[PDB]
Structures are given as C-alpha cells and as structure tokens.
C-alpha cells in the first residue's frame, strides 16, 4: 500500500551555522479511507519527539502525501548519527522503516583548481572558466561562482563522479563574456564541504 522515502539535509544547509538542516520523511500513496499516519523518530536507536509534521497535501492521483520533518544538528549529522523515520498506517501489515545516515567513510577534503579558458577559445563570443574540484569524500558538496562580491550566474556543474582511489570530483563551468574576462575581473569558485577548514574555501581566476 503506502510507500515511504527518507531524505538528507541540503548539503549547504548542513554546512553552515546560519542555516538549519532537516531530515524529511515522505509517505506517498497514503490512502484516503485510512489517511491517518503515525511516526516515530529514532536517532541512533534513541526515539525523539521534537519533530514537526507538514501540512497534509492531496496529490490528485487518489492518494495523500504526508510528510514528517525532523530538525537535526550540524554538529552531529556530519559526525555520523543514524537518523531513522518509522511509518505505520492502517493500510499496512507492519511498520516500514529506512534509516538515512550520511556517507560512511573518512572525511577527505577537496582541492580546488581554477583553470583559465583555453588559448584556443578567445575567438568565441564567450569563454569558459573552469573549476576542478578533486579528492573529496563524502560527495555531499556545494559549489558556486562569484565576482567582485556578486553572484555570477550562467554556470553549470557536473555531478560528483567516483574517482578511482575512493575519492570524488566534479567540474563547474562558468560562462562569461570574452569582454568581461579581458577586463581582468576576478571570478571566484566557492566550495563548501565538511572536510574544509570552516567548511569553506574560495579560489580565484582572472587575466
């Protein structure tokens, strides 16, 4: 009958103190005869009750989608605590459960590298600025591009791909106008990871 998925915090919500990370328990395909869904949260086997339930919204496919969401702690997500939802419904022989930890593996920090646009690409109307992010574990990460305090826009970032000695890497291409580039503006690649000093580093790129 019902079916349920468990979801981690947004990378960046977990790596900045400013923000507050959440784990989210989605229970799709809830009946409407027996729509009533009850939860139990556990953090490493330890049940916790401070955890809100989101407005119950109707899906238009003859089912309900009811979500529970549970605040977690930056401190103790990155450390490895194992969060576990636990749905029970009348339309359901036994309670279902899944457990969303993070990535079991030593944290390893990412190297960042800013690779200028190729000599052969100054003909084109626009040039590509490159950010090589290499050698991080887990692959949970955030990457952005800025310039002179301003959030440079038309960029695009490959997904993390496993890299042979256990680690992870991605690229991120920023596309600027050949003009801007030759003016000599600096463009920075900004990178957040649990294995960074203060979770943050920023590397620069310019004529």
């Amino acid at each position: 009958g019902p079916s349920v998925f468990l979801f981690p915090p947004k990378p960046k919500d977990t790596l900045m103190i400013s923000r507050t990370p959440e784990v989210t328990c989605v229970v799709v395909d809830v009946s409407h005869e027996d729509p009533e869904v009850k939860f139990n949260w556990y953090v490493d086997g330890v049940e916790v009750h401070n955890a809100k339930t989101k407005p119950r919204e109707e899906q238009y496919n003859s089912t309900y989608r009811v979500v529970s969401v549970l605040t977690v702690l930056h401190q103790d997500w990155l450390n490895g605590k194992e969060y576990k939802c636990k749905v029970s419904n009348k339309a359901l022989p036994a309670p279902i459960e899944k457990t969303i930890s993070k990535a079991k593996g030593q944290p390893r920090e990412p190297q960042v590298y800013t690779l200028p646009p190729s000599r052969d690409e100054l003909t084109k109307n626009q040039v590509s600025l490159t950010c090589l992010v290499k050698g991080f574990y887990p692959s949970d990460i955030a990457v952005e591009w800025e310039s002179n305090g301003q959030p440079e826009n038309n960029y695009k970032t490959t997904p993390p791909v496993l890299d042979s000695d256990g680690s992870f890497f991605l690229y991120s291409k920023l596309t600027v106008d050949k003009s801007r580039w030759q003016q000599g503006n600096v463009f920075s690649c900004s990178v957040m990871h649990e294995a960074l000093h203060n979770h943050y580093t920023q590397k620069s790129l310019s004529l």
Binding site: M16, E144, P151, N198, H199, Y200
Partner: peptide
C-alpha cells in the same frame, strides 16, 4: 575567526 559565504555565517573556529 569565521567563514562567510555571501555574508552568511558558515562556520567558525
């Protein structure tokens, strides 16, 4: 001293 992204506190040490 602390890390800032877009002026929003990341993490301090």
């Amino acid at each position: 001293d602390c890390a800032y992204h877009k002026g929003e506190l990341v993490w301090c040490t």
